[PDB]
Every structure is written in C-alpha cells, then in structure tokens.
Design a protein around this ligand. Sequence first.
Ligand code: MG
Ligand code: MG
Ligand code: MG
Ligand code: MG
Ligand code: MG
Ligand code: MG
Ligand code: MG
Ligand code: MG
Ligand code: MG
Ligand code: MG
Lengths: 141, 142, 185, 100, 57, 66, 62
Amino acid sequence: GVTVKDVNQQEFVRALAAFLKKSGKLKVPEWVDTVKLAKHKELAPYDENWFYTRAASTARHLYLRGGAGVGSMTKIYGGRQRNGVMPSHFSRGSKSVARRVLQALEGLKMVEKDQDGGRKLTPQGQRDLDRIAGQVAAAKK
Amino acid sequence: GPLQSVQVFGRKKTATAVAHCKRGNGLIKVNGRPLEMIEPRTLQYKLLEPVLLLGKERFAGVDIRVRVKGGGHVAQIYAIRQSISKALVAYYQKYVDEASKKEIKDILIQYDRTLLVADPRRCESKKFGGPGARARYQKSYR
Amino acid sequence: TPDIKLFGKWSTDDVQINDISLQDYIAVKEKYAKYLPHSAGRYAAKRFRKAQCPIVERLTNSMMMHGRNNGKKLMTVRIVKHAFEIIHLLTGENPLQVLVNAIINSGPREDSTRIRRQAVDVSPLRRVNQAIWLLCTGAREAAFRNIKTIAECLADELINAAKGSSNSYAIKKKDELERVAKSNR
Amino acid sequence: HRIRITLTSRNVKSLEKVCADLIRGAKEKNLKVKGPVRMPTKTLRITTRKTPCGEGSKTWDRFQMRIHKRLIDLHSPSEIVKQITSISIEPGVEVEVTIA
Amino acid sequence: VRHVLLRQGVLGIKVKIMLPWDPSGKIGPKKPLPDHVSIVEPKDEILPTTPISEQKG
Amino acid sequence: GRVRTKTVKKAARVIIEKYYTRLGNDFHTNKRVCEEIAIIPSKKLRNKIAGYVTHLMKRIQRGPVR
Amino acid sequence: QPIKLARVTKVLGRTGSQGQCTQVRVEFMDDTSRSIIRNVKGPVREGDVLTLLESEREARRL
RNA sequence: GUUAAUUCCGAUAACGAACGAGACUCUGGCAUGCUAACUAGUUACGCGACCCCGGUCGGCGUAACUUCUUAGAGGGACAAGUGGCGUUCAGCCACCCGAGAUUGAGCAAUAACAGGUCUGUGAUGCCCUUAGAUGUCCGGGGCUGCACGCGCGCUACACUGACUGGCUCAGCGUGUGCCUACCCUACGCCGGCAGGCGCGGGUAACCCGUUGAACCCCAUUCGUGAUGGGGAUCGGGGAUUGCAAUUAUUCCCCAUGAACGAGGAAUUCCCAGUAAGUGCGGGUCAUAAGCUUGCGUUGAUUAAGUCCCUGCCCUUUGUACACA
Ligand SMILES: [Mg+2]
Ligand SMILES: [Mg+2]
Ligand SMILES: [Mg+2]
Ligand SMILES: [Mg+2]
Ligand SMILES: [Mg+2]
Ligand SMILES: [Mg+2]
Ligand SMILES: [Mg+2]
Ligand SMILES: [Mg+2]
Ligand SMILES: [Mg+2]
Ligand SMILES: [Mg+2]
C-alpha cells in the first residue's frame, strides 16, 4: 500500500486528531482547558481540542523517529521567545504537556518506553497510522 | 542481475544531497518521500524541471533515492534539483550511449547552468569591527 | 510540455514587445522565461548580465524591500503569482503582456541631471530599472496602511500602468520627471 | 590482540612522518594493521584585543592553535607495540597506547 | 626583546637577526626563500653531427 | 592587474637563455621542464615563470628579442 | 517635435560632474545618413536603441 | 605607455643594490582519481514491524567500497588558446574550454606623534606615604543617584503584519579545572511555568546530538480602530544562584497598557552569497547578552564610472609658513 510519507502531513495530523475524536479514551488531564502550552507562547490556543492534534503530531513524530523523550519534545515544540524590549531567542516548550501526551499514549497502546531512554512506536500504532494514511490517500484520490 | 547503482552528490552553499539511481520503475523520492510533498510548495515546478524538460520516457526506467543533509530549505531543494539531474547524466553516461547523454546535457545547459554546475559562492567570513562581512559599525564623530 | 515552457499555467509565447528599444532588455521570450521567477543567482556579476535576467525575476527581487521584507523570495513569488491571477481575472489578457506594456509605458524616456540641471535621454536598461522601481514603489505605497492586499495593489498598479490612465503612482512620477526634463532643457 | 595507538600532534608533517613510520614498522614486522584514521582537527580560537590598555581603534587578534589526532589499530601482542613505540619518537607527537 | 635597568632609566633592546639558508638546516632554515629562484648551470654538451652506435653486451 | 614581476621575468630570461633547446610552445610541457631544471619553491611562482617563458617563446617565434 | 529612434554605434566617454553620463554617438534608424552625439545616463553598450523625444538637440563635445 | 602597486616596457650620469608591494601562510571551491577508517558511513543481503511482487524504517547485524564523513600527499589557473587594441614591447577587453579568467583575512617599509597605557606586570627612574598608613584585612554604601544634551545599539510604528496550531531544514563551536570551592546534559516522575527529585553518558567524531534554531511554508482568528501593532511604567505572587538581592541579580504567572501613524537640519555603512532580515556558539558568567567575536538560514536594489565634496599619492609652479 502506502506510508505516511506519501501522505500530505498537514491534513494527516487533522485526520489523526479526528481519529482520536472518534476513539475518545485518551484520559485527558483536568488542566487542559485553561493552560498555556509554553513559556514563550502568549495566549491559549484558538482550537478547543489542541491536545488531540498535538497527540497526533506526537504520534507521527515518533513514527518518523523513535526514542524521543521529553527534552526532544520540548525541542520540537520550541519557538520564538518574544522578550518585548529585548531581542528574541529560542525557547523550549512545556515539559508536562508532552509528558501527559506520552502518558496518554502509554495508557492506550500507541507508544512504548524503550531501552536507553525514550519512547518508541508500537506495531499497533504503526498499523493504525498506516490505516489512516490509506484513509487520507483514499480521501485525496 | 547486475546492479546498476549510481551514487552522485550535489552541493549547494552547505546542503549536500546524494542521489542514487538503479534499474527500476519511474518513481523518484527524496528521504523516503516523493517530490509532491517537499515544503515549501512554491518550488514544486522547480523540482519537476528535469522531468518536464526530459519527459517521462527518460525517467521511466530510472528510480532515484536521495539522502540529504545540511543547509536550509531552498538549499536542499536546489541540492536535490542539481543532484537528480547529475545522477541521470552519470547513469546515461555509464550504462547507455554517450550521444543521448550529450543531448540531455545540452538540454540541461540550454535551460540553466545550476542543474549541472554547482555554484561556488559560499558565506564570506565576518570581520572584526563590523556586524557583517563588509559592513562596519556606525562611526561616531564628535 | 517539453518543447514550449509554461510559466505556471502561462504561455511563454504570444508576448508582443511593442517598443523595439526595449526588445533586448526585456528578457521574456523563448529563452529566459522559466517555470518560476525564483533562481539561483550570479546575475550581478557582470555589468550587462542584469539584462539577461528575466523581468519577472527582476520584479520578484525588487519587491522585497524596507527592512522587514528583505530576504523573503518565496513570499514575494507568492505575491507575484497571485498578482498575475488578479491581473488575469480583471483584464482577461496575458499578465506577462500586461507587465511588458506597463514597463514600456511607465519607463521614462528622459531625465535631468547635474552637468542648474540639464536634460538627457536615458539608457533603455536604466529605463527598465526605473520602471521596475517606480511601479513597486507605487504598489507598496498603495498597500501600506490599507485593507487592500499587496497582490491586489500590485495588480492594480500594473493594470493602471498598462492602461496609462494617469491613476498609477509610477505613471504620475514618470510624467513628473518627463515634465521636469522638458522644462529644464 | 587489538591495541589502539592514538597520535596527537600540533605539527602536521611530523605527525604524518610518525604515523608513516608506524605503518612501515608494522609492515616490516608483518602484522595486520589498519590505515591511519584521521579525526576532525580542532582549532583552539582565542580573540583578544591588540591594545594592552583600552584606548585605540577596535582591532582584534585571532590566535589559532590547530591540534590533530590520528589513530592506528594493531592486531599484535603488547611487546611488539612497546618495541615499535619505543623507537623513533619526536617531541611534537604524543602517543597514547590503549591495550583494550 | 629584552630590558636593561640603568641608573637613570630602563632601556629596551630589540635584536633581529636573519638566518642564512642552508641545505642541512643546522645553521638556518631548510626551506629556501620564496623569491630566490635557484637556477642551475647547464652542462656542456657536444651535439653529434654524425650518427654512430655504442653497441655493447 | 596580471603583471609579472622582475623575479619572474629575469629568472625566465635566465631559463630561456640556458635551456633554449629544451623549452617549447606548449605550456604544460615547458612548465614541467622549468620545474625539472629550476629550483622553484612554490607552484604559483612556477606557473608565473612558465607563463612568461611561453610568452617569450612566442616573442622569439615572432621575431628577435632584445 | 516628433519622436525618433536612434541606435548606439560608439560610446565616446564618461561625462557629467560626478561621472554619470555616457557620451554616445547615435546613428538614426529612420535616416541612416544623419548621426549625432548626445550625453546619455545609464549603462550603455554598443548596439541598442534609445527613444529620443527630439533629435534637434546636441551635446557639446569636450 | 602600462599596473591595484617605484608593476613592468623603454629612455638615461648613471651603475650595482636593499626594505615595502608582489612573492608567502591560512581559508573557499574542483578532483566519481591516490591514501584512509566499528569515535562517519554507503549500498547489498539476513531478519523484525506495518500497508495493499512492491514501499518506508537514524529498528537490529554483517559484505565490499569511499559518492556523501574527515584529513594527508599531489594536481589544477598561467592572460595559457582564439578575436581585436597597443612602439606590435610592457600590457588591456571580450570569447571557447573550463569549479574558479579580481574569494577573503594575517603579515606588512623609512621617519614620527611629546597619541593611549605607571589602573597588566615582582618592566621601571624620580617624587609622596610608611603604623593614627596611599600597605593589607573586615562591615555597609557607591561605581546604578537625575531639571538636562550627546554617542553606540535593541524594540517597534503593523495587513508584505500579529496570534494560534501543523510541517521543516544548519554550521562554527563549547563541555567536569594546580590554587579553583564553579561542566554539557540524555531519560523517568512532581508542577502551568520558572524549576525540583533519581539513576545514567561524556576528558569528546563515543554523550548531550541526525545539534528536530529561527526567518520562511501551510491552515484558522484579526479588519485600518493607537487595533489582537508596540510593551515602557507599576502592583501582587512563585522558583534558581550566592554568606548577603533592599536601589526590584535573573527567570515564570496574572494584571496595569504610555509615547510611537515611516521621523526636520545633519550623518553612518555597503556593492555578491554582499547589505539587510533571522537565529545559534565563545568571551565577560556562581547567578548573565539589548555588547563583542565567530557561524549558519533566506537573500536582493543599483554600479563596472568620477574628482563635484571629503581626502590621499607623483610632476611643475609661488611662498613673507617651518610649534609648517
Ligand atoms: Mg519550532
Ligand atoms: Mg495591505
Ligand atoms: Mg606619548
Ligand atoms: Mg600626552
Ligand atoms: Mg569592602
Ligand atoms: Mg560604569
Ligand atoms: Mg493594545
Ligand atoms: Mg502584541
Ligand atoms: Mg562589555
Ligand atoms: Mg607670487
């Protein structure tokens, strides 16, 4: 068939977010609705289900490369730290939000903790990712 | 039977892209994904340029796999742009006749020198007493 | 399409350059038109290698100005592409032909200089460069502090320069420089 | 059996002469030898002011120290390695002999 | 560059000595000067106008 | 300014004066010939001397040299 | 005062105060026998056409 | 006459010379060729995972090799070939072949300033002090004080922009110390964050690290309103460093929401991977980048000229100047 690399990723993360909407058992934390996702961000996100979209993005990043822990997730979710009157720099994201994403993906079997540190992606998660890759391929065809 | 493996590098300012041609079907992919999804998408026809110039008949028998490291976005795009064309020219030089290789080389040269010859321009070193290479800080009289 | 080149969805051919003075210095026909106005570089090496640069690439390069926009060439490629779309959806002609006519109309045939100022007729390459600078300056002045986007402003400036209805800032500055040169000669 | 010689030096042609001499010694004493593996060199960079005091034009020195490190893997016992490395060493090259 | 402490003040001495070139390298440096192009003299040869042979062995 | 210096020109005149029979018109031949006969420390100076040797040999083939 | 085209046949030299005007010999492509000398701003190579608004003027040769 | 050059050709009461420039060293390219490699890999296989024979894997192991990795010897470019200009000499322009047909820095002559440095030195003359010390040690304050002006820089004045998500690429580098008490940090839990708690790796192509940096790309929210631009000022709280933060050391959260609508006279820097936008390393560092020094990404406008201004270098001319 196809893989996720033949699939356009921008609608693919939304499709896996819709898949998590269909599943609905990720056991979201209580402080999801009110928290700001980073020290360098300013506002809360405009979308009400940013947790599912970021878990979709976490799933496809762990599919592309495994063994990515909390520091690597803050590295991929870092950005500009607008210091106001001072020049901007790079700032990593929040640790606990990606920690809860990995706890949800360890709760329902999409990732697994690997030796020598980090999270790898399980063959069940690879199965679901290639199924939704075929879904987005059949949608765009 | 015999492996027609051709490994050809292509260089921008810092980005290096090594294309790999074999005997196979007409598929071209870079870092495990084809040319249709390489962001930014404004340089999609720039990636399609050797296919549009040479037709699908030349690329039908050649499969190209490219490993890329270094540079930026436009640097990697122009690196794979140069590398797949140089890899096809080296493949058609080694395994088929030199006349079609010379014709394809003429077609590439009459379009752009960047498709074959790499640009030797690299970043000039910053000097002391300036924010950049040639520019100096603002001299203050009085 | 291996033989004829298609600028996106636009044809290289059917582009009539009216002014024979601007025939060589407008590099748009049969050799210099490509798929995108983006390129590698090297055009600023020799003196008249700038004439061999295509005019859509020259507009793409001259659009990025004023600090915050320097070095966004993919972004101004997007601007020029949507501007060509708006030019087609308003006029109903070739956007390349509209831009060539805009260069021919907006390019000032004479200027005045210090040899008290005396008027002299300018070089055609300098005239092309002056037209590209003036229409870009008019488009940026129309887009600054305005609801109307940069693509719509650049399309309106090129269409007004191709029409010559004295509503464009480039046409106005061209007529002003031509009137000053007619006065001090 | 696998003994690793690490050759660190500041000068270039002297280090090349030392590693070539070790290659010729291994070839004369008939043992399996790997090629001289180059490491990426290190450029110790110091940027100070030329003026001892603070009053002058803004000039800056660039003190560079280039260091180089090659390595040679030998398939030989320890006495052969000691006998080879005891002979013909020059002060520019520091030798680190790892038994394992 | 050296110092000397006299009674009235302190004097500095700068001695710069250019070493001559040698093939051995004991009295000076081994590398010759970048401007000195050492051109050797050609040997005196006599061109033979008569073809002869030197057959031996 | 690609102007040859006196250390190039006088040494080239000495080479052509002593070894006129060996030198020729081809640059890549008489460059190696000048490398063999003369002790030249650097490749750039060797190329300058070889180029001025080729130019003086062109002057000799055209006419008499002062 | 009609508009006349003129092809550059020879550039003479740099003129102007700051050195910004090329002294240019132009042959008219309408009347091929008549030719004049004018100062021209901008980069000028041999063999291109200027669109002169009047042909009656002439620059002073220095 | 020519050159970036007192660089050469040629004349010649000059000849023979010397420093400088040039030459040289490093850096950047080009070598499908040589040497190399379990502290870089490549492509083939053997498996493993997933999708409908084929595709992906920085998931694992090994089979030749070095194209990508690194660093050594070499080579390559010289106005050499062509067409013109030129005393047909010195040299100049364009073109073919070609990775280059001016890449950048270091070094840098004679003579001087009464240029800066005694607050770099246990480099130092002379003068002052030397026990109620200008020596040395400790506590606190100051070097931050604010009617004012100047300078180097940062933030911006937005719609070519801001916010919120998703995609996605770097290279210079640095890292556990003689005294020295102070390293880079992976990963798992706690917390929204600043951070804290435990096992590990690394004296370095081994680990941080495939350094998942930003600009940019894609998709919503905004609608020309001092607005979701801009974040100055100020209140409340929570963490780290240190013996000690008050005159808030820094960082994080909420809130307060000023001028500024592209800037007068005047002035700075620059022409190719250059300016500019943009972020990342080193120094200062216990805590620490609005500076500086390097590096990387995106990447142009215009120019192949001139003495108009500012100045410099030769020749002639005049001088009542020679601290000129
Ligand atoms: Mg980011
Ligand atoms: Mg607008
Ligand atoms: Mg003094
Ligand atoms: Mg003084
Ligand atoms: Mg005290
Ligand atoms: Mg102070
Ligand atoms: Mg507001
Ligand atoms: Mg804001
Ligand atoms: Mg400072
Ligand atoms: Mg008088």
